[PDB]
Amino acid sequence: AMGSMERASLIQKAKLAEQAERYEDMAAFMKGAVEKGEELSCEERNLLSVAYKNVVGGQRAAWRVLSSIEQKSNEGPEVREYREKVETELQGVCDTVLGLLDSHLIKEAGDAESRVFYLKMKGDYYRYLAEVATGDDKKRIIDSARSAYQEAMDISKKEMPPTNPIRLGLALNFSVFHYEIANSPEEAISLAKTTFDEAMADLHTLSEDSYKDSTLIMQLLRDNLTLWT
């Protein structure tokens, strides 16, 4: 849809949309930028992620509200119908993001910071699909999330220091995957603890600014561990 706008104009308008809290617009602008076919810079990857995280976040929150009303009702068809409507739109956004990652962001990503970033995103959007899935479909979706997170983890441990914020955010999200998608709370706790401890020992290498970036995400690991133990 954005084929007629310059790549640089799409990125500029994504930043404007962010300032205006117009995240559906922001996501459409960044989808257009991706579809230009060039690789994305670090800033551009983060614009892409922020845009779709905001869009899918609203959908997830709405789906949970409606699912809760529906479950209570099952303790007319309208609640189920409308939950299904939101669910289908949520699945559509996840499919769009996964489509961008498959065509062709991941295959052109060779540096660890880009490849880990995109594989983490792939795990995340399969995880959001898993939150609303059932049955055998759910098992295959969960396996897809796990496989993406695991490839990202393997690269991040080989190629990034333990305080790298991308590596930290990946570990955070993979631990939440374990806790509440994979029903593996012990794996979740182990991963969060080990990640936190190995990052602690590497903080001595960091500048003041990098220290703030890394400790911010470490606090999220701690927040979860506090709820989990």
Binding site: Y23, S49, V50, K53, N54, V55, V56, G57, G58, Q59, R60, A61, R64, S68, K120, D124, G169, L170, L172, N173, V176, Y179, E180, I217, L220, L221, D223, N224, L227, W228
Partner: peptide, 12 residues
């Protein structure tokens, strides 16, 4: 639902 901390915007 109690949502645990994950990376990036807390948009839900």
């Amino acid at each position: 639902k109690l949502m645990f901390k994950t990376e990036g915007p807390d948009s839900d």
